[PDB]
Amino acid sequence: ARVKRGVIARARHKKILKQAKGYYGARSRVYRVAFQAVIKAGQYAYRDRRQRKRQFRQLWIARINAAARQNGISYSKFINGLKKASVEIDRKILADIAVFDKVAFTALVEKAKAALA
Amino acid sequence: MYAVFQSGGKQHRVSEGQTVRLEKLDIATGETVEFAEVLMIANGEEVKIGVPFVDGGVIKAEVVAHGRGEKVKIVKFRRRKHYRKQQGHRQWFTDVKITGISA
Amino acid sequence: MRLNTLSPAEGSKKAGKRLGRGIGSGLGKTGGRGHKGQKSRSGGGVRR
Amino acid sequence: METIAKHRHARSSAQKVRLVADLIRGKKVSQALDILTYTNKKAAVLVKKVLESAIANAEHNDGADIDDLKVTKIFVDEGPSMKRIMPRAKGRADRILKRTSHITVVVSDR
Amino acid sequence: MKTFTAKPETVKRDWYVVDATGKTLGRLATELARRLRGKHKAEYTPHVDTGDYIIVLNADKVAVTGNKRTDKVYYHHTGHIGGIKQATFEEMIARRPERVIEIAVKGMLPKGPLGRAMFRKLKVYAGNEHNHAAQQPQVLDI
Amino acid sequence: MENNSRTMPHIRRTTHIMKFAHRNSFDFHFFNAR
RNA sequence: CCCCGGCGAGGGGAGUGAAAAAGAACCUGAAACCGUGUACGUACAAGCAGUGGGAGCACGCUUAGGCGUGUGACUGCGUAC
RNA sequence: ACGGGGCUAAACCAUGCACCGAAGCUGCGGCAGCGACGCUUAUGCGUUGUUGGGUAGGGGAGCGUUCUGUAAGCCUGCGAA
Ligand SMILES: NCCC[C@H](N)C(=O)O
Ligand SMILES: [K+]
Ligand SMILES: [K+]
Ligand SMILES: [K+]
Ligand SMILES: [K+]
Ligand SMILES: [Mg+2]
Ligand SMILES: [Mg+2]
Ligand SMILES: [Mg+2]
Ligand SMILES: [Mg+2]
Ligand SMILES: [Mg+2]
Ligand SMILES: [Mg+2]
Ligand SMILES: [Mg+2]
Ligand SMILES: [Mg+2]
Ligand SMILES: [Mg+2]
Ligand SMILES: [Mg+2]
Ligand SMILES: [Mg+2]
Ligand SMILES: [Mg+2]
Ligand SMILES: [Mg+2]
Ligand SMILES: [Mg+2]
Ligand SMILES: [Mg+2]
Ligand SMILES: [Mg+2]
Ligand SMILES: [Mg+2]
Ligand SMILES: [Mg+2]
Ligand SMILES: [Mg+2]
Ligand SMILES: [Mg+2]
Ligand SMILES: [Mg+2]
Ligand SMILES: [Mg+2]
Ligand SMILES: [Mg+2]
Ligand SMILES: [Mg+2]
Ligand SMILES: [Mg+2]
């Protein structure tokens, strides 16, 4: 019962090199380098599914801060005023209204200014 | 005219006719959903800000599809320590089509 | 009752240990022997 | 109509012939014959006999006219290498590669 | 829904003019770095230059506090061995006064090809005169 | 001795080539970590 | 058998054959490696070369839009096994 | 011999209220392990509690390859490997 390895080992190597397309040099041609690069690309992707949630909230807060300062208030007082006024809109939607509907954002600032005063 | 409602632990800004992808709902395909927890309704500089909810505000939508999302590959690797393991994942969703924002 | 319908009783055909066949098997790279010394060597180990 | 001539197992390396084949790529064949005449390379003698044989192939086997033809494709491929043994100092033996080439000239009036 | 991204072909940039007479150096430079980056706009994107053009007049009349007019020292190296060179604040004002504000703002901008393109919108002049009247700069009382 | 070399069948003792202490220009002042 | 070539090597036709990219360097004809063509990127730009975000361009779709494929300016993080 | 720019506070001390901040906690969806109780099982389902970083190493369950039987069967020149 002698088993030759030609068909199975070729299909295993071809599966890795298909995932290594677009990589530079031996990282897309050579199996020893490509396998090593596909594992690192999976570690980065696992890490950046956590980092993607951090970077978007960083982008929403920076946009809320800029549009709130156009109305005479900082970020930290605008968030405190919306919590006191029982408004439960999250930072994704607030930064989206701050770009696309600017007078509806003005209505939220005046709501937050009333709850602080 | 848009509105803001919460569903599936997340919030969405939708309008009439728009197709929105949510988390999985236990509703059959073709059945109507109602969202009574509406957070804000804006219609041409008349803004109803809910405190937390615009009461009297309901969003109606029609379930059009279920399905699983694109496969995500999960890779864990610890160098020089003889450890790796791998895992796949597909996430369920529900597509709804917004039919009425009634303030 | 055919030649492709017969089965062994459940629990009578445990599969054997195959050492040194990758990470996922739990027995790769040392075959359960640990790192160096007399007991990890081929033909190694002290007498009775 | 496209017309091919080839020189297979031509005795020279592909890097040396490719210097001469990049001179005449895209040219009219009357202009390309003059470039090869005044190029002082051994590979320019090789490429000229394949270009001359492609011109004769196209007027005899295809009925084309010589004033219309252009070199649309030209490329050199690597052939089999011959393995020789070169003695070095102190008993060392090196391997010599004697590289060959496949010259392909393509002419067409279109 | 994906979050809005500003597109660099349809971004609106505007022109401002700032008078640096009697301003504190660093406190003026922090506001110039916000507006060259575009931190004051709601369309702010971290990989797009959404900032403004700013003209700075009277760079030789900027102010520092303490003893920093004689004690703040600017260093550079030339690449030749033993080639460390220094200059005090008073000598940078006397010799090339526009560099004082340009060096201060450059340290507050991001580092990379986008931060070098944000620096190109700063126009610093040692006197009261600029020749950018065709761009109609707005007076920014900052 | 290397008796069945196929790349170099003409030579059996080749350590005068690559081993540094067996070359003709080896000097014992290279071995000064004593 | 005809043509180019040195009465060469090598090739192009013609013909045989189910097939000649089965032509004697001959079944199938993988990979490293080396080329030709096309799309996009690249000559003010610093590092394990990916990953997360993302403009523009090209080709397909199908529409009263924004999807698919290729490329990836710019930007966050990131020192192989 | 602040990470840099810069800073006379953007330093230090005391008090106070906001906000940022992790794979911690919460929300929504999904999978699995071990207990307990059950529409009743025939050993699977339902409810609920809890758990799921991991080297050496121990335990459990699988994929695929060649060969023998089932197979003088089944697929295949209307195209097998
Ligand atoms: N006795 C002499 C044998 C020589 C041989 N070719 C060698 O290299 O040893
Ligand atoms: K053991
Ligand atoms: K064949
Ligand atoms: K090949
Ligand atoms: K990057
Ligand atoms: Mg074993
Ligand atoms: Mg183990
Ligand atoms: Mg031991
Ligand atoms: Mg060992
Ligand atoms: Mg030890
Ligand atoms: Mg032994
Ligand atoms: Mg022993
Ligand atoms: Mg010699
Ligand atoms: Mg000799
Ligand atoms: Mg001999
Ligand atoms: Mg046939
Ligand atoms: Mg034929
Ligand atoms: Mg046959
Ligand atoms: Mg063959
Ligand atoms: Mg081939
Ligand atoms: Mg450039
Ligand atoms: Mg420069
Ligand atoms: Mg610091
Ligand atoms: Mg907070
Ligand atoms: Mg978090
Ligand atoms: Mg967390
Ligand atoms: Mg947790
Ligand atoms: Mg575990
Ligand atoms: Mg069989
Ligand atoms: Mg088979």
Short mmCIF file of N, CA and C (backbone and C1' of nucleotides) in Angstrom, two decimals, chain H residues 2-55:
data_model
loop_
_atom_site.label_atom_id
_atom_site.label_comp_id
_atom_site.label_asym_id
_atom_site.label_seq_id
_atom_site.Cartn_x
_atom_site.Cartn_y
_atom_site.Cartn_z
P C H 2 15.27 67.38 28.98
"O5'" C H 2 13.82 66.83 29.29
"C5'" C H 2 13.15 65.96 28.40
"C4'" C H 2 11.68 65.92 28.70
"C3'" C H 2 10.83 65.00 27.84
"O3'" C H 2 10.93 63.66 28.31
"C1'" C H 2 9.76 67.11 28.11
P G H 3 10.07 62.44 27.71
"O5'" G H 3 10.18 62.59 26.13
"C5'" G H 3 11.08 61.78 25.40
"C4'" G H 3 10.83 61.86 23.92
"C3'" G H 3 10.56 63.23 23.34
"O3'" G H 3 11.72 64.02 23.21
"C1'" G H 3 9.06 61.68 22.41
P G H 4 11.62 65.59 23.53
"O5'" G H 4 11.14 66.24 22.16
"C5'" G H 4 11.88 66.05 20.97
"C4'" G H 4 11.08 66.44 19.76
"C3'" G H 4 10.53 67.85 19.72
"O3'" G H 4 11.49 68.82 19.34
"C1'" G H 4 8.83 66.36 19.12
P G H 5 11.47 70.28 20.00
"O5'" G H 5 10.25 71.02 19.30
"C5'" G H 5 10.23 71.23 17.90
"C4'" G H 5 8.85 71.54 17.40
"C3'" G H 5 8.26 72.86 17.84
"O3'" G H 5 8.72 73.94 17.05
"C1'" G H 5 6.66 71.15 18.13
P G H 6 9.32 75.25 17.73
"O5'" G H 6 8.06 76.16 18.03
"C5'" G H 6 7.88 76.78 19.29
"C4'" G H 6 6.64 76.26 19.97
"C3'" G H 6 6.39 76.77 21.38
"O3'" G H 6 5.80 78.05 21.38
"C1'" G H 6 6.14 74.44 21.35
P C H 7 6.22 79.16 22.45
"O5'" C H 7 5.44 78.75 23.77
"C5'" C H 7 4.04 78.51 23.76
"C4'" C H 7 3.61 77.83 25.02
"C3'" C H 7 3.97 78.56 26.29
"O3'" C H 7 3.04 79.60 26.57
"C1'" C H 7 4.47 76.26 26.52
P U H 8 3.53 81.11 26.79
"O5'" U H 8 3.73 81.21 28.35
"C5'" U H 8 2.88 80.46 29.21
"C4'" U H 8 3.03 80.87 30.64
"C3'" U H 8 2.90 82.36 30.91
"O3'" U H 8 2.09 82.55 32.07
"C1'" U H 8 4.95 81.51 31.78
P A H 9 0.50 82.81 31.93
"O5'" A H 9 -0.10 81.54 31.17
"C5'" A H 9 -0.75 80.48 31.85
"C4'" A H 9 -0.71 79.21 31.03
"C3'" A H 9 -1.42 78.00 31.62
"O3'" A H 9 -1.57 77.05 30.57
"C1'" A H 9 0.87 77.59 31.60
P A H 10 -2.98 76.74 29.89
"O5'" A H 10 -2.72 75.36 29.15
"C5'" A H 10 -2.65 74.14 29.88
"C4'" A H 10 -1.37 73.36 29.63
"C3'" A H 10 -0.10 73.92 30.27
"O3'" A H 10 0.77 72.84 30.60
"C1'" A H 10 0.15 73.84 27.92
P A H 11 0.56 71.95 31.91
"O5'" A H 11 1.80 72.31 32.82
"C5'" A H 11 3.06 71.69 32.64
"C4'" A H 11 4.03 72.09 33.73
"C3'" A H 11 3.61 71.73 35.14
"O3'" A H 11 3.91 70.39 35.47
"C1'" A H 11 4.34 73.96 35.09
P C H 12 2.86 69.50 36.27
"O5'" C H 12 2.94 70.04 37.76
"C5'" C H 12 4.12 69.85 38.53
"C4'" C H 12 4.11 70.66 39.80
"C3'" C H 12 2.92 70.45 40.72
"O3'" C H 12 3.02 69.29 41.51
"C1'" C H 12 3.35 72.76 40.49
P C H 13 1.71 68.44 41.84
"O5'" C H 13 1.01 69.25 43.01
"C5'" C H 13 1.68 69.50 44.23
"C4'" C H 13 0.87 70.42 45.11
"C3'" C H 13 -0.60 70.09 45.26
"O3'" C H 13 -0.85 69.02 46.16
"C1'" C H 13 -0.35 72.41 44.91
P A H 14 -2.10 68.05 45.90
"O5'" A H 14 -3.36 68.92 46.31
"C5'" A H 14 -3.57 69.36 47.64
"C4'" A H 14 -4.74 70.30 47.73
"C3'" A H 14 -6.03 69.83 47.10
"O3'" A H 14 -6.71 68.85 47.86
"C1'" A H 14 -5.67 72.09 46.55
P U H 15 -7.55 67.70 47.12
"O5'" U H 15 -8.90 68.42 46.71
"C5'" U H 15 -9.74 68.99 47.69
"C4'" U H 15 -10.75 69.93 47.10
"C3'" U H 15 -11.69 69.35 46.06
"O3'" U H 15 -12.71 68.53 46.59
"C1'" U H 15 -10.93 71.47 45.35
P G H 16 -13.19 67.23 45.78
"O5'" G H 16 -14.03 67.83 44.57
"C5'" G H 16 -15.23 68.53 44.83
"C4'" G H 16 -15.74 69.27 43.62
"C3'" G H 16 -16.08 68.43 42.40
"O3'" G H 16 -17.31 67.74 42.53
"C1'" G H 16 -14.93 70.39 41.73
P C H 17 -17.51 66.31 41.82
"O5'" C H 17 -18.03 66.67 40.36
"C5'" C H 17 -19.23 67.40 40.18
"C4'" C H 17 -19.25 68.13 38.86
"C3'" C H 17 -19.23 67.27 37.62
"O3'" C H 17 -20.50 66.75 37.30
"C1'" C H 17 -17.66 69.03 37.39
P A H 18 -20.64 65.44 36.37
"O5'" A H 18 -20.43 66.00 34.91
"C5'" A H 18 -19.81 65.22 33.91
"C4'" A H 18 -19.41 66.06 32.74
"C3'" A H 18 -18.74 65.32 31.60
"O3'" A H 18 -19.67 64.74 30.71
"C1'" A H 18 -17.43 67.18 32.19
P C H 19 -19.72 63.15 30.53
"O5'" C H 19 -18.73 62.89 29.32
"C5'" C H 19 -18.77 63.70 28.16
"C4'" C H 19 -17.40 63.90 27.58
"C3'" C H 19 -16.62 62.65 27.23
"O3'" C H 19 -17.03 62.07 26.01
"C1'" C H 19 -15.21 64.19 28.34
P C H 20 -16.85 60.50 25.74
"O5'" C H 20 -15.31 60.35 25.40
"C5'" C H 20 -14.76 60.97 24.25
"C4'" C H 20 -13.27 60.83 24.23
"C3'" C H 20 -12.74 59.42 24.26
"O3'" C H 20 -12.76 58.80 22.99
"C1'" C H 20 -11.53 60.76 25.78
P G H 21 -13.14 57.26 22.86
"O5'" G H 21 -11.99 56.49 23.65
"C5'" G H 21 -10.66 56.39 23.14
"C4'" G H 21 -9.72 55.89 24.20
"C3'" G H 21 -10.02 54.50 24.75
"O3'" G H 21 -9.44 53.48 23.97
"C1'" G H 21 -9.69 56.01 26.54
P A H 22 -10.34 52.62 22.97
"O5'" A H 22 -10.07 51.13 23.42
"C5'" A H 22 -8.78 50.56 23.33
"C4'" A H 22 -8.69 49.27 24.08
"C3'" A H 22 -9.87 48.33 23.96
"O3'" A H 22 -9.89 47.64 22.72
"C1'" A H 22 -8.99 48.36 26.18
P A H 23 -11.25 47.04 22.13
"O5'" A H 23 -11.44 45.72 22.98
"C5'" A H 23 -12.52 44.82 22.77
"C4'" A H 23 -12.18 43.42 23.23
"C3'" A H 23 -11.48 43.31 24.58
"O3'" A H 23 -11.94 42.13 25.24
"C1'" A H 23 -10.12 42.35 22.90
P G H 24 -13.08 42.24 26.36
"O5'" G H 24 -12.32 42.82 27.62
"C5'" G H 24 -11.91 41.99 28.70
"C4'" G H 24 -12.29 42.61 30.02
"C3'" G H 24 -13.78 42.83 30.21
"O3'" G H 24 -14.39 41.69 30.79
"C1'" G H 24 -12.62 44.85 30.66
P C H 25 -15.73 41.03 30.19
"O5'" C H 25 -16.88 42.01 30.67
"C5'" C H 25 -17.15 42.20 32.04
"C4'" C H 25 -18.07 43.37 32.23
"C3'" C H 25 -19.34 43.33 31.41
"O3'" C H 25 -20.36 42.53 31.96
"C1'" C H 25 -18.32 45.44 31.17
P U H 26 -21.33 41.70 31.00
"O5'" U H 26 -22.25 42.81 30.32
"C5'" U H 26 -23.16 43.58 31.09
"C4'" U H 26 -23.77 44.71 30.30
"C3'" U H 26 -24.53 44.32 29.05
"O3'" U H 26 -25.82 43.79 29.31
"C1'" U H 26 -23.16 46.17 28.57
P G H 27 -26.44 42.67 28.35
"O5'" G H 27 -26.76 43.45 26.99
"C5'" G H 27 -27.77 44.45 26.94
"C4'" G H 27 -27.83 45.10 25.58
"C3'" G H 27 -28.07 44.17 24.40
"O3'" G H 27 -29.44 43.83 24.27
"C1'" G H 27 -26.34 45.69 23.87
P C H 28 -29.88 42.31 24.05
"O5'" C H 28 -29.70 42.07 22.49
"C5'" C H 28 -30.38 42.86 21.53
"C4'" C H 28 -29.78 42.68 20.17
"C3'" C H 28 -29.53 41.25 19.73
"O3'" C H 28 -30.69 40.58 19.29
"C1'" C H 28 -27.64 42.57 19.24
P G H 29 -30.83 39.00 19.54
"O5'" G H 29 -29.84 38.35 18.49
"C5'" G H 29 -30.15 38.35 17.11
"C4'" G H 29 -28.99 37.89 16.27
"C3'" G H 29 -28.45 36.51 16.55
"O3'" G H 29 -29.27 35.46 16.07
"C1'" G H 29 -26.65 37.99 16.30
P G H 30 -29.33 34.06 16.86
"O5'" G H 30 -27.93 33.36 16.54
"C5'" G H 30 -27.63 32.93 15.23
"C4'" G H 30 -26.17 32.55 15.09
"C3'" G H 30 -25.71 31.35 15.87
"O3'" G H 30 -26.09 30.11 15.31
"C1'" G H 30 -24.13 33.07 16.10
P C H 31 -26.43 28.88 16.28
"O5'" C H 31 -25.01 28.25 16.64
"C5'" C H 31 -24.13 27.79 15.62
"C4'" C H 31 -22.75 27.50 16.15
"C3'" C H 31 -22.64 26.50 17.28
"O3'" C H 31 -22.82 25.15 16.88
"C1'" C H 31 -21.20 28.32 17.70
P A H 32 -23.45 24.09 17.91
"O5'" A H 32 -22.31 23.85 18.99
"C5'" A H 32 -21.17 23.06 18.70
"C4'" A H 32 -20.07 23.28 19.71
"C3'" A H 32 -20.29 22.70 21.09
"O3'" A H 32 -20.08 21.30 21.14
"C1'" A H 32 -19.42 24.88 21.28
P G H 33 -20.84 20.40 22.22
"O5'" G H 33 -20.03 20.63 23.56
"C5'" G H 33 -18.68 20.21 23.66
"C4'" G H 33 -18.06 20.61 24.98
"C3'" G H 33 -18.77 20.14 26.23
"O3'" G H 33 -18.50 18.79 26.53
"C1'" G H 33 -18.19 22.41 26.47
P C H 34 -19.65 17.86 27.14
"O5'" C H 34 -19.77 18.33 28.65
"C5'" C H 34 -18.66 18.25 29.53
"C4'" C H 34 -18.90 19.03 30.80
"C3'" C H 34 -20.14 18.64 31.57
"O3'" C H 34 -19.96 17.47 32.34
"C1'" C H 34 -20.00 21.00 31.43
P G H 35 -21.23 16.61 32.79
"O5'" G H 35 -21.75 17.37 34.09
"C5'" G H 35 -23.12 17.63 34.27
"C4'" G H 35 -23.37 18.71 35.28
"C3'" G H 35 -24.79 18.79 35.80
"O3'" G H 35 -25.03 17.88 36.85
"C1'" G H 35 -24.09 20.94 35.13
P A H 36 -26.32 16.94 36.82
"O5'" A H 36 -27.54 17.95 37.02
"C5'" A H 36 -27.79 18.53 38.29
"C4'" A H 36 -28.81 19.63 38.19
"C3'" A H 36 -30.18 19.22 37.69
"O3'" A H 36 -30.96 18.55 38.67
"C1'" A H 36 -29.52 21.21 36.63
P C H 37 -32.03 17.43 38.23
"O5'" C H 37 -33.20 18.25 37.53
"C5'" C H 37 -34.06 19.08 38.29
"C4'" C H 37 -34.97 19.88 37.41
"C3'" C H 37 -35.91 19.10 36.50
"O3'" C H 37 -37.06 18.60 37.16
"C1'" C H 37 -34.85 20.79 35.25
P G H 38 -37.97 17.47 36.47
"O5'" G H 38 -38.96 18.29 35.52
"C5'" G H 38 -39.59 17.67 34.41
"C4'" G H 38 -39.67 18.62 33.23
"C3'" G H 38 -40.18 18.02 31.93
"O3'" G H 38 -41.59 17.99 31.85
"C1'" G H 38 -38.20 19.24 31.52
P C H 39 -42.32 17.00 30.81
"O5'" C H 39 -42.76 17.95 29.60
"C5'" C H 39 -42.92 17.40 28.30
"C4'" C H 39 -43.49 18.39 27.31
"C3'" C H 39 -43.99 17.79 26.00
"O3'" C H 39 -45.30 17.23 26.08
"C1'" C H 39 -42.63 19.67 25.54
P U H 40 -45.52 15.66 25.85
"O5'" U H 40 -44.42 14.98 26.78
"C5'" U H 40 -43.92 13.67 26.52
"C4'" U H 40 -42.63 13.72 25.73
"C3'" U H 40 -42.06 12.37 25.30
"O3'" U H 40 -41.42 12.54 24.03
"C1'" U H 40 -40.44 13.54 26.52
P U H 41 -41.26 11.31 23.01
"O5'" U H 41 -40.32 10.29 23.79
"C5'" U H 41 -39.16 9.73 23.18
"C4'" U H 41 -37.95 10.60 23.40
"C3'" U H 41 -36.60 9.91 23.16
"O3'" U H 41 -35.74 10.77 22.40
"C1'" U H 41 -36.64 10.90 25.32
P A H 42 -35.71 10.67 20.79
"O5'" A H 42 -34.59 9.59 20.47
"C5'" A H 42 -34.91 8.20 20.31
"C4'" A H 42 -33.94 7.33 21.06
"C3'" A H 42 -33.89 5.86 20.68
"O3'" A H 42 -32.54 5.41 20.80
"C1'" A H 42 -34.43 6.07 22.98
P U H 43 -31.56 5.45 19.52
"O5'" U H 43 -30.89 6.89 19.57
"C5'" U H 43 -30.01 7.25 20.63
"C4'" U H 43 -30.25 8.66 21.11
"C3'" U H 43 -29.04 9.38 21.69
"O3'" U H 43 -29.13 10.76 21.37
"C1'" U H 43 -30.74 9.23 23.34
P G H 44 -27.81 11.62 21.03
"O5'" G H 44 -28.39 12.99 20.45
"C5'" G H 44 -28.93 13.05 19.13
"C4'" G H 44 -30.37 13.51 19.14
"C3'" G H 44 -30.64 14.86 19.78
"O3'" G H 44 -30.36 15.96 18.92
"C1'" G H 44 -32.20 13.30 20.59
P C H 45 -29.98 17.39 19.55
"O5'" C H 45 -31.39 18.02 19.95
"C5'" C H 45 -32.36 18.33 18.97
"C4'" C H 45 -33.72 18.54 19.59
"C3'" C H 45 -33.84 19.72 20.55
"O3'" C H 45 -34.05 20.94 19.87
"C1'" C H 45 -34.84 17.80 21.51
P G H 46 -33.53 22.33 20.49
"O5'" G H 46 -34.49 22.60 21.73
"C5'" G H 46 -35.84 22.99 21.51
"C4'" G H 46 -36.61 23.13 22.81
"C3'" G H 46 -36.02 24.08 23.83
"O3'" G H 46 -36.34 25.43 23.56
"C1'" G H 46 -36.66 22.06 24.89
P U H 47 -35.33 26.60 23.97
"O5'" U H 47 -35.47 26.70 25.55
"C5'" U H 47 -36.58 27.35 26.14
"C4'" U H 47 -36.60 27.19 27.64
"C3'" U H 47 -35.46 27.84 28.40
"O3'" U H 47 -35.61 29.23 28.58
"C1'" U H 47 -35.78 25.64 29.19
P U H 48 -34.31 30.17 28.52
"O5'" U H 48 -33.51 29.82 29.85
"C5'" U H 48 -34.02 30.17 31.12
"C4'" U H 48 -33.24 29.52 32.23
"C3'" U H 48 -31.77 29.92 32.33
"O3'" U H 48 -31.57 31.16 32.97
"C1'" U H 48 -31.96 27.57 32.50
P G H 49 -30.28 32.04 32.61
"O5'" G H 49 -29.12 31.36 33.46
"C5'" G H 49 -29.21 31.34 34.88
"C4'" G H 49 -28.16 30.46 35.51
"C3'" G H 49 -26.72 30.73 35.13
"O3'" G H 49 -26.16 31.87 35.75
"C1'" G H 49 -27.11 28.41 35.11
P U H 50 -25.14 32.82 34.96
"O5'" U H 50 -23.84 31.92 34.76
"C5'" U H 50 -23.02 31.56 35.86
"C4'" U H 50 -22.11 30.41 35.51
"C3'" U H 50 -21.04 30.69 34.47
"O3'" U H 50 -19.89 31.31 35.01
"C1'" U H 50 -22.14 28.68 33.93
P U H 51 -18.96 32.25 34.09
"O5'" U H 51 -18.08 31.24 33.23
"C5'" U H 51 -17.15 30.35 33.84
"C4'" U H 51 -16.75 29.24 32.89
"C3'" U H 51 -16.02 29.67 31.63
"O3'" U H 51 -14.65 29.89 31.85
"C1'" U H 51 -17.71 28.11 31.08
P G H 52 -13.85 30.98 30.98
"O5'" G H 52 -13.68 30.31 29.56
"C5'" G H 52 -12.94 29.10 29.39
"C4'" G H 52 -12.98 28.66 27.95
"C3'" G H 52 -12.70 29.72 26.91
"O3'" G H 52 -11.32 29.96 26.72
"C1'" G H 52 -14.58 28.42 26.26
P G H 53 -10.53 31.08 27.56
"O5'" G H 53 -9.17 31.26 26.76
"C5'" G H 53 -9.11 31.83 25.47
"C4'" G H 53 -7.68 32.16 25.12
"C3'" G H 53 -6.74 30.98 24.95
"O3'" G H 53 -6.81 30.39 23.66
"C1'" G H 53 -5.73 32.58 26.34
P G H 54 -6.71 28.80 23.46
"O5'" G H 54 -5.25 28.39 23.96
"C5'" G H 54 -4.09 28.65 23.19
"C4'" G H 54 -2.85 28.60 24.05
"C3'" G H 54 -2.36 27.21 24.45
"O3'" G H 54 -1.49 26.68 23.47
"C1'" G H 54 -2.47 28.63 26.35
P U H 55 -1.07 25.14 23.42
"O5'" U H 55 0.45 25.14 23.86
"C5'" U H 55 1.44 25.80 23.08
"C4'" U H 55 2.82 25.57 23.64
"C3'" U H 55 3.11 24.15 24.08
"O3'" U H 55 3.51 23.31 23.02
"C1'" U H 55 3.79 25.66 25.76
#
